[PDB]
PDB file of C-alpha atoms and ligand atoms in Angstrom:
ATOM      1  CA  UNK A   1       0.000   0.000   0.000  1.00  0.00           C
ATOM      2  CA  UNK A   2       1.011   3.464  -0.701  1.00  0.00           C
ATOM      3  CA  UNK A   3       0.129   7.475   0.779  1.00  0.00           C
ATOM      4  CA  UNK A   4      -2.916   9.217  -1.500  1.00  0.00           C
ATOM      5  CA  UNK A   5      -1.809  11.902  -3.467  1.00  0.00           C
TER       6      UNK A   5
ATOM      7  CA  UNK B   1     -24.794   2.169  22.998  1.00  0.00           C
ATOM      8  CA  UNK B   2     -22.013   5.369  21.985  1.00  0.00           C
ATOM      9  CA  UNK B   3     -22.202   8.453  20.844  1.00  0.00           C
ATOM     10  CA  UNK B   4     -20.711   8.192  16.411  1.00  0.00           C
ATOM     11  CA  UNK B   5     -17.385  10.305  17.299  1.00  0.00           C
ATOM     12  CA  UNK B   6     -16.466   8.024  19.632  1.00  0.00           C
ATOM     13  CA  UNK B   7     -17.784   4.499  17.696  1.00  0.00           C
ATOM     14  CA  UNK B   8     -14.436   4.911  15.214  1.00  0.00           C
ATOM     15  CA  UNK B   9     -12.618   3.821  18.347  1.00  0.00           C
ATOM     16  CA  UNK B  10     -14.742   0.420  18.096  1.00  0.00           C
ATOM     17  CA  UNK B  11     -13.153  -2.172  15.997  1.00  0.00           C
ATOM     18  CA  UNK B  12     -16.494  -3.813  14.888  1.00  0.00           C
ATOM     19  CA  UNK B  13     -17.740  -0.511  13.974  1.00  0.00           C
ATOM     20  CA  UNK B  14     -14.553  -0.028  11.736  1.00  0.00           C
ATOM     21  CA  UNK B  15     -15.076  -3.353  10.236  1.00  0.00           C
ATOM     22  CA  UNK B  16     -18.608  -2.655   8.897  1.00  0.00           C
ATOM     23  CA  UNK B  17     -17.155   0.309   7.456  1.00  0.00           C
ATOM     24  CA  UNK B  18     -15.904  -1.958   4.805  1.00  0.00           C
ATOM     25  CA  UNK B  19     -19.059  -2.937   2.677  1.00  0.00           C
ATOM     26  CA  UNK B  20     -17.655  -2.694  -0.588  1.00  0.00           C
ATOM     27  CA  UNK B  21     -13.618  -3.721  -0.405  1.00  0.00           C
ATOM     28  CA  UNK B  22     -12.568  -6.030  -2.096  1.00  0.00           C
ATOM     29  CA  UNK B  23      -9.845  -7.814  -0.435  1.00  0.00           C
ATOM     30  CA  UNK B  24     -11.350 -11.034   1.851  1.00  0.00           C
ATOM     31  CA  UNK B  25     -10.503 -14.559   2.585  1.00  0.00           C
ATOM     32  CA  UNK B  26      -7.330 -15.335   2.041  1.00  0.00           C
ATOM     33  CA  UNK B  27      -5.625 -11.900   1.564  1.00  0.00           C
ATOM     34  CA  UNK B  28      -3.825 -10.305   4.799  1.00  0.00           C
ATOM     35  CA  UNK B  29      -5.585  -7.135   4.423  1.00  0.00           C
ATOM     36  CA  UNK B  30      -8.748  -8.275   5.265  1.00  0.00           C
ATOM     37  CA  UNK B  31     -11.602  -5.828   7.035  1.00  0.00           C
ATOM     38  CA  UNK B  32     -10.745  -7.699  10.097  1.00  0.00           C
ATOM     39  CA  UNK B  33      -7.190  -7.436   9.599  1.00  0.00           C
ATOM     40  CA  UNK B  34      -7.821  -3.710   8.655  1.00  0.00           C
ATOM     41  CA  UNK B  35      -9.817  -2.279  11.290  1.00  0.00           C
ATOM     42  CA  UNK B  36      -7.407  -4.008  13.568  1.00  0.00           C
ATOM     43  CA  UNK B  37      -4.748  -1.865  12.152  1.00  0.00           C
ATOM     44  CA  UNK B  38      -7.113   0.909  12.855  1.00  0.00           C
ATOM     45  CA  UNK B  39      -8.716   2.001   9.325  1.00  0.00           C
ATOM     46  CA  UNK B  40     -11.841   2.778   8.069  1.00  0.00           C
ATOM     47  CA  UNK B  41     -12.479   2.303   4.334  1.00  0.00           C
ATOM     48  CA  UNK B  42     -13.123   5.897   3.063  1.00  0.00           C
ATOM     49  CA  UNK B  43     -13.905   4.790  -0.840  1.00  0.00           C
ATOM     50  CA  UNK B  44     -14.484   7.318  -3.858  1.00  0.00           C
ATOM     51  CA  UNK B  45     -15.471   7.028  -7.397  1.00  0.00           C
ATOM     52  CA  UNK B  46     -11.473   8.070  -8.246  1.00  0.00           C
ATOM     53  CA  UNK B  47      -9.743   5.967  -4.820  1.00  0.00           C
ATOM     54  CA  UNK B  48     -11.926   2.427  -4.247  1.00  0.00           C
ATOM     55  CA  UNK B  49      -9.664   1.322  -2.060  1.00  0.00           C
ATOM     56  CA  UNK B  50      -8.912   4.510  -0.157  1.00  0.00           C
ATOM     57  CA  UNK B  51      -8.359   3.218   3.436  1.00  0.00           C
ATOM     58  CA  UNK B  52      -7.782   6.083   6.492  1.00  0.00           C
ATOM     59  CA  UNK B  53      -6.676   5.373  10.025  1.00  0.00           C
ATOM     60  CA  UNK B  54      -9.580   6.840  12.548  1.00  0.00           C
ATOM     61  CA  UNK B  55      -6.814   8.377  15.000  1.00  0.00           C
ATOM     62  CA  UNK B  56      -3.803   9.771  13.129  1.00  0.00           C
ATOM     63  CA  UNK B  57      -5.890  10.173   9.524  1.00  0.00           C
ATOM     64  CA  UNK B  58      -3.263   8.725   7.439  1.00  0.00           C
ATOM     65  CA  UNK B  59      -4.506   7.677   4.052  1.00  0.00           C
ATOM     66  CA  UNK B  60      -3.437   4.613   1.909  1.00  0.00           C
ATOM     67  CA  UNK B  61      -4.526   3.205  -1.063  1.00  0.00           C
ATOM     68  CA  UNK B  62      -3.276   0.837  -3.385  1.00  0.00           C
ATOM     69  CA  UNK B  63      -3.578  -1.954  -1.081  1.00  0.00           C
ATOM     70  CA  UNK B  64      -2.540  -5.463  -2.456  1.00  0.00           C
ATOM     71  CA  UNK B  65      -3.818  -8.901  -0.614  1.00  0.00           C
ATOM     72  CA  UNK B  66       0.029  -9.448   0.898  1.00  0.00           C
ATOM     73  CA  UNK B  67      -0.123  -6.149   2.389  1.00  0.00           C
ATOM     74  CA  UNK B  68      -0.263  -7.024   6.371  1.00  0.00           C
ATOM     75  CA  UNK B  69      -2.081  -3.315   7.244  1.00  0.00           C
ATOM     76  CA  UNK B  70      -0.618  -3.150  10.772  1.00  0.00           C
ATOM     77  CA  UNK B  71       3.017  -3.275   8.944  1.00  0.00           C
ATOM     78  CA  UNK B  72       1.844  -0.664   6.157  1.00  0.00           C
ATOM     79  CA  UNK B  73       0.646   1.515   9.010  1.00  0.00           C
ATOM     80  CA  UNK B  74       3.770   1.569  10.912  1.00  0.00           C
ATOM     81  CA  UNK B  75       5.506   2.418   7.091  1.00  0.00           C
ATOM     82  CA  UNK B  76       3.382   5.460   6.611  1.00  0.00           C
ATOM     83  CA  UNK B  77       2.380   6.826   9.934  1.00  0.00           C
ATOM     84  CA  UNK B  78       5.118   5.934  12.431  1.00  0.00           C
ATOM     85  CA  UNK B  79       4.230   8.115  14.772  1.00  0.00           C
ATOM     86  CA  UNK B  80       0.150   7.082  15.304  1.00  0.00           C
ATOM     87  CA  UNK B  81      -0.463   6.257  18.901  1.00  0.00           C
ATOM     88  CA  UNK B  82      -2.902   3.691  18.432  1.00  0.00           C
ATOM     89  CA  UNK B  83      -0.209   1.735  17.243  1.00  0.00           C
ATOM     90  CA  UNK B  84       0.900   1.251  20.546  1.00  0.00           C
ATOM     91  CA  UNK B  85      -2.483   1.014  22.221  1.00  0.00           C
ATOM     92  CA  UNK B  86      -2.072  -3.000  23.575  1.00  0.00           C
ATOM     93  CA  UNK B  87      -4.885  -3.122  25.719  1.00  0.00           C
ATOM     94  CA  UNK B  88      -9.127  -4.041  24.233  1.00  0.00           C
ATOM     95  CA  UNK B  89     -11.109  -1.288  24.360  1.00  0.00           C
ATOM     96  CA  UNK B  90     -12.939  -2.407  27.495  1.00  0.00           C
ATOM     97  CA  UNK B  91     -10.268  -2.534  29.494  1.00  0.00           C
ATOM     98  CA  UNK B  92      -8.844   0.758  28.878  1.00  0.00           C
ATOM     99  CA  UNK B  93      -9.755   3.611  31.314  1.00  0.00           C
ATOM    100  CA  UNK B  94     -11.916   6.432  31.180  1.00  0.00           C
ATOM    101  CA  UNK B  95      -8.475   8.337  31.735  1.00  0.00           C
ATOM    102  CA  UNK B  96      -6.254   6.335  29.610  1.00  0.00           C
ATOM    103  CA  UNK B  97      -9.378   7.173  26.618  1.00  0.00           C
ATOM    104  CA  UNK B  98     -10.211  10.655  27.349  1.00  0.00           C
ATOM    105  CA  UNK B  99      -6.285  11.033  26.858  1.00  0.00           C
ATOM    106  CA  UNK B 100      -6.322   9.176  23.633  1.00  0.00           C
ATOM    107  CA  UNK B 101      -9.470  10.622  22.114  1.00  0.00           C
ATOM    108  CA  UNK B 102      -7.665  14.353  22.774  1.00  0.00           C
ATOM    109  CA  UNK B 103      -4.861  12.932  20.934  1.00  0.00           C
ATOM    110  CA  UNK B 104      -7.037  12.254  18.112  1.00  0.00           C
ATOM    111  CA  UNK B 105      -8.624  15.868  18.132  1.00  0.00           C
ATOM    112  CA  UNK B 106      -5.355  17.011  17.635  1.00  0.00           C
ATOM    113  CA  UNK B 107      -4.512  14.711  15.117  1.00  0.00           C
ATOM    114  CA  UNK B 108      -7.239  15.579  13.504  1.00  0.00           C
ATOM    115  CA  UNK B 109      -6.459  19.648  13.545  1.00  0.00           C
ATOM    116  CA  UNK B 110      -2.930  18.667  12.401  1.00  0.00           C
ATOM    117  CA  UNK B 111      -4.438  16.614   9.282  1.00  0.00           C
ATOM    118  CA  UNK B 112      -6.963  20.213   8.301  1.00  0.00           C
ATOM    119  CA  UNK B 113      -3.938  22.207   8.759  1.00  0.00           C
ATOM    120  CA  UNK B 114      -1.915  19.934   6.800  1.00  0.00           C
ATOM    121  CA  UNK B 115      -4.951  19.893   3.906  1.00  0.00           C
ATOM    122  CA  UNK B 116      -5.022  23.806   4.213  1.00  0.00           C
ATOM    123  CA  UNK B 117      -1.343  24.275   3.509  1.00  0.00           C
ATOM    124  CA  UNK B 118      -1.668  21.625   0.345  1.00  0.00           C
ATOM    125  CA  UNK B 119      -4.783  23.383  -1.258  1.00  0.00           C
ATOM    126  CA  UNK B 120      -2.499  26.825  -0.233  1.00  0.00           C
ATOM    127  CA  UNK B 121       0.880  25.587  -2.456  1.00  0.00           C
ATOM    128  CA  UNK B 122      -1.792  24.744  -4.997  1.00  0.00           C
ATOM    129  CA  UNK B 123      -3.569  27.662  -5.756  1.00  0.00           C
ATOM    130  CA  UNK B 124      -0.586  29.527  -5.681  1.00  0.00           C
ATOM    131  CA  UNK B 125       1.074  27.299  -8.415  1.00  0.00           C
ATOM    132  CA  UNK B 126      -1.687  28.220 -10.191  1.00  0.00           C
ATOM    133  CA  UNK B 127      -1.522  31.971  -9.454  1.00  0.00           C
ATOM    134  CA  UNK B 128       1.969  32.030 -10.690  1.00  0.00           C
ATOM    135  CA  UNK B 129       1.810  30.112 -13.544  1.00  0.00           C
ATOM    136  CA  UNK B 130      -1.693  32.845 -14.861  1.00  0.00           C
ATOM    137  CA  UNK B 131       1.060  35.487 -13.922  1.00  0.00           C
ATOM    138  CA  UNK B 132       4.099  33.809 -15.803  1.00  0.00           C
ATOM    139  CA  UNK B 133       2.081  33.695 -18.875  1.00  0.00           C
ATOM    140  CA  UNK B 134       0.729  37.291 -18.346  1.00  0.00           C
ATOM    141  CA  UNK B 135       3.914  38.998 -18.144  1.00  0.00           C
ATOM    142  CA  UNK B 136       5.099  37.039 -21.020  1.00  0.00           C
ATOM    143  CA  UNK B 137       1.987  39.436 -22.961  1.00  0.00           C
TER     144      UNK B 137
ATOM    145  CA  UNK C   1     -16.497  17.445  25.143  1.00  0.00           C
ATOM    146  CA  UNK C   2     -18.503  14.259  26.715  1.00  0.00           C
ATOM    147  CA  UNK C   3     -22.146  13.374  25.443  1.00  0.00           C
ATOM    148  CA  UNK C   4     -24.415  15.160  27.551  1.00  0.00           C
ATOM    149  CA  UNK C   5     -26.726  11.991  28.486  1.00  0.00           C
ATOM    150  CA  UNK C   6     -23.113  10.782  30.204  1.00  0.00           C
ATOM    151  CA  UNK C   7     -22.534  14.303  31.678  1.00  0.00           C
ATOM    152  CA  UNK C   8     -24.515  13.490  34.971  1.00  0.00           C
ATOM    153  CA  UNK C   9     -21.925  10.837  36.001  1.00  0.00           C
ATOM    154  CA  UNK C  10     -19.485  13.491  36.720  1.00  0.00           C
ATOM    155  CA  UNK C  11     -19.992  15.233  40.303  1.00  0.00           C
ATOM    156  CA  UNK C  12     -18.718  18.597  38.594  1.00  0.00           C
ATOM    157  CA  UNK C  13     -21.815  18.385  35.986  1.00  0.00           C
ATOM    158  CA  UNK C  14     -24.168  17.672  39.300  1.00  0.00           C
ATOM    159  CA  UNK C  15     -23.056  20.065  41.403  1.00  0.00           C
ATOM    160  CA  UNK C  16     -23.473  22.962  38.333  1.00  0.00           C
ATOM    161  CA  UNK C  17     -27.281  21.708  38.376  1.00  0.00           C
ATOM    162  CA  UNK C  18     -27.496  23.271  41.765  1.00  0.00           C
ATOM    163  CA  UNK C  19     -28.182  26.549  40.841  1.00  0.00           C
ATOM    164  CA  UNK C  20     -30.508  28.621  43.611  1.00  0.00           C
ATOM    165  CA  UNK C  21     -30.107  25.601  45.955  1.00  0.00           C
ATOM    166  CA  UNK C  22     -30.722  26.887  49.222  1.00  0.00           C
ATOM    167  CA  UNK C  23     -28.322  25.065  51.714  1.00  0.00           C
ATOM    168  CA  UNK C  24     -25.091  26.397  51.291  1.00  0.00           C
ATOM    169  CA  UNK C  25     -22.015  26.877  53.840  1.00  0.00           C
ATOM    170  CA  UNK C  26     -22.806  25.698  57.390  1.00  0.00           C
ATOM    171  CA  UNK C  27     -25.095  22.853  56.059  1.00  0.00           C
ATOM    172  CA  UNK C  28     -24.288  19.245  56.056  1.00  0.00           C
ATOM    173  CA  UNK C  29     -26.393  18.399  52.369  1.00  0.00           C
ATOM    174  CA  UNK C  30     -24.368  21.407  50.233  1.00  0.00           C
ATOM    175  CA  UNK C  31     -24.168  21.260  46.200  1.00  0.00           C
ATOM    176  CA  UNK C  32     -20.942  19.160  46.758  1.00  0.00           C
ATOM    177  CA  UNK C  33     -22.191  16.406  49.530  1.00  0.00           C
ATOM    178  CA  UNK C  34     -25.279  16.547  47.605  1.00  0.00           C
ATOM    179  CA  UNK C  35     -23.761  15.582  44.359  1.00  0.00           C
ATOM    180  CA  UNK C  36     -21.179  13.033  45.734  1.00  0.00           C
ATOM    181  CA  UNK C  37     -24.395  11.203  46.973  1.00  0.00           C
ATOM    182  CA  UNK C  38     -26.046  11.144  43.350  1.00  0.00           C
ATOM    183  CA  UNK C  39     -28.429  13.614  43.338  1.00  0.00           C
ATOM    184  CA  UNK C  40     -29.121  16.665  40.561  1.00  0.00           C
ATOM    185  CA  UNK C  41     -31.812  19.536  41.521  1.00  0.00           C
ATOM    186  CA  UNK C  42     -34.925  18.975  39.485  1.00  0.00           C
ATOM    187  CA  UNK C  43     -37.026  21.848  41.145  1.00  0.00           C
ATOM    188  CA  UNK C  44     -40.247  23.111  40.140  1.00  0.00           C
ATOM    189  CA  UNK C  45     -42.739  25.638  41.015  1.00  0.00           C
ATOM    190  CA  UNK C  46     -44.366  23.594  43.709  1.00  0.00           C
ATOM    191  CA  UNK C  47     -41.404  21.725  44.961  1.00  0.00           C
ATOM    192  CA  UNK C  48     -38.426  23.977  44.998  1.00  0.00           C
ATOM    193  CA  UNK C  49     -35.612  21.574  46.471  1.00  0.00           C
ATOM    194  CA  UNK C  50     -36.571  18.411  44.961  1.00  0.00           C
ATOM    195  CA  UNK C  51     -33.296  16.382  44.056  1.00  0.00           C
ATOM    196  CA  UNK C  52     -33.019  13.305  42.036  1.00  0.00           C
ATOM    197  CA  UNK C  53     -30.398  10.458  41.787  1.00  0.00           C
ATOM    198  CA  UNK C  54     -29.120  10.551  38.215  1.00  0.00           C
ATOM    199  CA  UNK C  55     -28.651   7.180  38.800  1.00  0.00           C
ATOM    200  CA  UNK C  56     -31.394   4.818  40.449  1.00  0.00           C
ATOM    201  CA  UNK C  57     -33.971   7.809  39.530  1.00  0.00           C
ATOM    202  CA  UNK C  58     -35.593   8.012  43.477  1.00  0.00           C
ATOM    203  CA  UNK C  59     -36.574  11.467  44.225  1.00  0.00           C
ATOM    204  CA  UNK C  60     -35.681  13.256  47.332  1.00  0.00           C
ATOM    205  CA  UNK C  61     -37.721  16.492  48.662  1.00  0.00           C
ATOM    206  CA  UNK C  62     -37.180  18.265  52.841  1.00  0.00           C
ATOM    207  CA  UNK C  63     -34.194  18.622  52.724  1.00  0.00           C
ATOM    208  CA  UNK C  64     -33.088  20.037  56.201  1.00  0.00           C
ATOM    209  CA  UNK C  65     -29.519  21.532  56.675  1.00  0.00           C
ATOM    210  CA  UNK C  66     -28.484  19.083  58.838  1.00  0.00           C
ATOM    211  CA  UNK C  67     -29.481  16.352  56.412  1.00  0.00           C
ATOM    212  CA  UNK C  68     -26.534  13.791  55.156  1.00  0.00           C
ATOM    213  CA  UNK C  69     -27.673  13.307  51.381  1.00  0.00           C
ATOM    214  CA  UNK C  70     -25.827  10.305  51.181  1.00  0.00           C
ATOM    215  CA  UNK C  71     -27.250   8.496  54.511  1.00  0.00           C
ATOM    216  CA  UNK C  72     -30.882   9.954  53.323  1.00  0.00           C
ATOM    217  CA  UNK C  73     -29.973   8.160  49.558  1.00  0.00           C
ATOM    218  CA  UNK C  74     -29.339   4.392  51.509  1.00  0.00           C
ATOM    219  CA  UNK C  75     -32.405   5.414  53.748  1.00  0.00           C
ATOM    220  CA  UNK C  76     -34.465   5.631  50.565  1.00  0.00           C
ATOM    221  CA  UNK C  77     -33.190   3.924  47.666  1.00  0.00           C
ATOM    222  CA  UNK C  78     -31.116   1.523  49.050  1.00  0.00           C
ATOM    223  CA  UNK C  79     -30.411  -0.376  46.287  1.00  0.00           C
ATOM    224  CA  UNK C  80     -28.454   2.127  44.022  1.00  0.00           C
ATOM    225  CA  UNK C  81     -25.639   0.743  42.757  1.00  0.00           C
ATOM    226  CA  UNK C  82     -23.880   4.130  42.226  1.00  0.00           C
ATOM    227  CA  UNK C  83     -23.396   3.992  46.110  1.00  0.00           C
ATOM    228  CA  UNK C  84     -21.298   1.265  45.491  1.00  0.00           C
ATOM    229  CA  UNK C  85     -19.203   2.820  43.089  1.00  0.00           C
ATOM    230  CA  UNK C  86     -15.437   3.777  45.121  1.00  0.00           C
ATOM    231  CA  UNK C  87     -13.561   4.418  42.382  1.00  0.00           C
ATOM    232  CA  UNK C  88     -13.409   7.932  40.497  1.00  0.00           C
ATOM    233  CA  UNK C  89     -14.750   8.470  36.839  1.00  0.00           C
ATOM    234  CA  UNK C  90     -11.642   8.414  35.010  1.00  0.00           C
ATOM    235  CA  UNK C  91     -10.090   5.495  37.090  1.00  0.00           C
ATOM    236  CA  UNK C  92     -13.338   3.173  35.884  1.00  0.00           C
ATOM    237  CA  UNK C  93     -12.698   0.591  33.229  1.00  0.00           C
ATOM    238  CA  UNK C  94     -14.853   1.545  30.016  1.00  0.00           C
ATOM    239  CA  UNK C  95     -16.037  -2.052  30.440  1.00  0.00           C
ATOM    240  CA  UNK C  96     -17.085  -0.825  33.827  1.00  0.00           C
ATOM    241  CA  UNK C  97     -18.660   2.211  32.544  1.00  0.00           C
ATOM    242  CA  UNK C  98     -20.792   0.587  30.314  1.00  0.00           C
ATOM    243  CA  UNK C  99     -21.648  -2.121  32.935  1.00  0.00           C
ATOM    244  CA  UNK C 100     -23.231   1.238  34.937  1.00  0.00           C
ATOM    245  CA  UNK C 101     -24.501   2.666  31.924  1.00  0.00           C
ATOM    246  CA  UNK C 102     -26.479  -0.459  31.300  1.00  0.00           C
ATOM    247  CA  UNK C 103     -27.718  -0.665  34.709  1.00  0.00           C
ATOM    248  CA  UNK C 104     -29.011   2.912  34.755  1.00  0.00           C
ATOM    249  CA  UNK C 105     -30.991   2.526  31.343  1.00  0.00           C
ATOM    250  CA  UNK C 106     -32.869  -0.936  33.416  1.00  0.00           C
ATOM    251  CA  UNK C 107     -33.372   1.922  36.075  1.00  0.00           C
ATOM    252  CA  UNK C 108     -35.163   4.794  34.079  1.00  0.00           C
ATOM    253  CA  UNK C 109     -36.862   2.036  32.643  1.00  0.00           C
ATOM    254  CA  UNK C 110     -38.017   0.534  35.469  1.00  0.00           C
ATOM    255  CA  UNK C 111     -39.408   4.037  36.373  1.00  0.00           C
ATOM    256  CA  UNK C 112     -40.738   4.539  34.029  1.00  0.00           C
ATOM    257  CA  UNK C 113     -42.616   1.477  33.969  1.00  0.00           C
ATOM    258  CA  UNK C 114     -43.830   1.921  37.555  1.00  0.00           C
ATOM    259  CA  UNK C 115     -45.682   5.260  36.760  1.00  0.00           C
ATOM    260  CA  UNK C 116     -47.000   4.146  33.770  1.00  0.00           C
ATOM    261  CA  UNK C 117     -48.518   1.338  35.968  1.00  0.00           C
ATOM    262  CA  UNK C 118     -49.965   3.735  38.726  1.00  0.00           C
ATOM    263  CA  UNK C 119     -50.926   5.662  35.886  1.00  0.00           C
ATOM    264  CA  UNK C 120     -53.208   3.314  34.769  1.00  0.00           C
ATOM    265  CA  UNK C 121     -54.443   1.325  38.180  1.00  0.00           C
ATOM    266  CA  UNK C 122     -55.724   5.588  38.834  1.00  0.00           C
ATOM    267  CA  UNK C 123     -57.425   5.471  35.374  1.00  0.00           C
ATOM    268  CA  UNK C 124     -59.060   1.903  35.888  1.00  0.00           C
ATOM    269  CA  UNK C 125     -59.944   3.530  39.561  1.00  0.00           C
ATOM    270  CA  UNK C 126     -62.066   5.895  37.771  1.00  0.00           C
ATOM    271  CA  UNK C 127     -63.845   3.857  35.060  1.00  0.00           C
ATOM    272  CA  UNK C 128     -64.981   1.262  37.300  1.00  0.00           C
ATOM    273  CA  UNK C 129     -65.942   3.502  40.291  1.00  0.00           C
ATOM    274  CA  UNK C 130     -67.927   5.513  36.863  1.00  0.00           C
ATOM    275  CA  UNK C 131     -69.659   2.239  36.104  1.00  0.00           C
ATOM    276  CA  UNK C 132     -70.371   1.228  39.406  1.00  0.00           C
ATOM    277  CA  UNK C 133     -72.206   4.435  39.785  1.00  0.00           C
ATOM    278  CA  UNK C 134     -74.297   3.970  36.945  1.00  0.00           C
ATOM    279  CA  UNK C 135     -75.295   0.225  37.737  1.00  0.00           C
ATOM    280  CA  UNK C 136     -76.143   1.562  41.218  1.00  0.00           C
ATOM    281  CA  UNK C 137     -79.598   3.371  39.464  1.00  0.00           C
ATOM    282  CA  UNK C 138     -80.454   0.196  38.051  1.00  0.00           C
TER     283      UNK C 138
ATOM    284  CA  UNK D   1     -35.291  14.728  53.779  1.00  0.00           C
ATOM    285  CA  UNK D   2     -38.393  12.080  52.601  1.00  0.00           C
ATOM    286  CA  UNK D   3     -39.764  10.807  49.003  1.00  0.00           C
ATOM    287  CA  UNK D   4     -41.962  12.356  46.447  1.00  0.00           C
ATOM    288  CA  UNK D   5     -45.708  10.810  46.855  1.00  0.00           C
TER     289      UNK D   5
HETATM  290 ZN1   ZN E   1      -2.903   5.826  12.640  1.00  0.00          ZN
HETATM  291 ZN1   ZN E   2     -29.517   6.449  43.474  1.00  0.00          ZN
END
């Protein structure tokens, strides 16, 4: 999983 | 039952925020697995999979069914006290949760200010940019 | 920044219902004693001290200076568990919490029930006394 | 100090 951008 | 700022704190409520998701048996970010980490699924038409933690408001998406959430939390949100929260719910105090739902109002304010200060940068991107292209006429 | 229904758990939120309470320094049942005993000041127009346990619900009026609001509670509603509580608010267990919460919902229901009940026995009073009276002619 | 009746 990743940060929204 | 409890009043809905407080039910976040409630890992069955965070659960059955998770109608839609589409990660389940056999993947290790399962609703369980992911309210246990301390998210609530906070979908959109663009983000499906947008998950947020209820206490420090970290977002994450792109989730993949080998992602363990507890370890993606700690990657992208070191800092998040309920990461260190060992004891159930029940067994906390009244102390021990007024302190840790204060924390969470702060986190909270942090998060706005940090949205502010993003929507800020942008607009004045665009601002110079409209003047950039003025001054070349 | 706690829900209001909860609000009357904390002695601080009791003793701020005591507003034109009349027993005040030199009396044994003050704001305070009164609301480390339970009790939150419901007056009205016709009974201007009446105090009520925010817990069990009973309903205290007389109060005389000398009065001990929590021996007068155990004199008349001795089962109230909140005079068993020792420990402080924030030093109770959330599991504990809700254990109290749970039994003071059963309490305002079981109120609630009882007037509804004397309520009605008044009501059925009046109907049969009402046919009574009108057999009575014939 | 007695109860409502
Ligand atoms: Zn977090
Ligand atoms: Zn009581």
């Amino acid at each position: 999983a990743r940060t929204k951008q | 039952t409890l009043p809905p700022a407080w039910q976040p704190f409630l890992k069955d409520h965070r659960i059955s925020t998770f109608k839609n998701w589409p990660f389940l048996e056999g993947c290790a970010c399962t609703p369980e697995r992911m309210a246990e980490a301390g998210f609530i699924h906070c979908p959109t038409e663009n983000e499906p999979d947008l998950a947020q933690c209820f206490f420090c408001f970290a977002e994450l998406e792109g989730w993949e069914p080998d992602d363990d959430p507890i370890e993606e939390h700690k990657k992208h949100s070191s800092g998040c006290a309920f990461l260190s929260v060992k004891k159930q719910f029940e067994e906390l105090t009244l102390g021990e949760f007024l302190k840790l739902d204060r924390e969470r109002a702060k986190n909270k304010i942090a998060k706005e200010t940090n949205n502010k200060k993003k929507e800020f940068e942008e607009t004045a991107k665009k601002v110079r940019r409209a003047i950039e292209q003025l001054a070349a006429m």
